[PDB]
Amino acid sequence: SYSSYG
Ligand SMILES: [Zn+2]
């Protein structure tokens, strides 16, 4: 999984 906030 890949999650990015920013
Ligand atoms: Zn950004």
Six token digits for residue 2? 């890949």
Q: Rounded to the nearest whole angstrom, what is the distance from the C-alpha of residue 5 to the centroid of ligand 1?
A: 8
Q: 1: number of CA atoms within 13 Å, CB side?
A: 2
Q: Scanning the structure block, which residue is given the tokens 């906030």?
A: 5
Query: Please, what's the b/e burial string for 1-6 (b: 16 or more CB within 10 A of its CB; e: otherwise)?
Result: eeeeee
Q: Rounded to the nearest whole angstrom, what is the distance from the C-alpha of residue 4 to the centroid of ligand 1?
A: 9
Q: Scanning the structure block, which residue is given the tokens 């890949």?
A: 2
Q: Rounded to the nearest whole angstrom, what is the distance from the C-alpha of residue 6 to the centroid of ligand 1?
A: 4
DSSP 1-6: ------
